[PDB]
Amino acid sequence: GTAEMPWSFDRLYRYEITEVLEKKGLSVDDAFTVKVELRALNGSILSS
Amino acid sequence: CNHPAGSFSVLGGETEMPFIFDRLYKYDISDPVRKLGLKLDSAGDIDL
Hints:
The structure is cut from a larger assembly and holds two copies of chain A. Chain A is low in regular secondary structure.
């Protein structure tokens, strides 16, 4: 919101990708890219 | 408080590739605490 102190996490956060990578049609060694898209409830897209 | 506890450097130059660290860096400060004598487990009365 607006009234929360600036908080930073201690370390990284994980999400599961093994199934989507294996069903893509490639193994771990191949080089790919990861894109992140934002969607706020305001009704717009923020800065990726 | 004016108690020294240690120091370390950071590598930085204006021609740096913007980067970030994925893990929490760890540093050892046990010895000055031991010298000060307040018990390490009951560290609930210190700050840095």
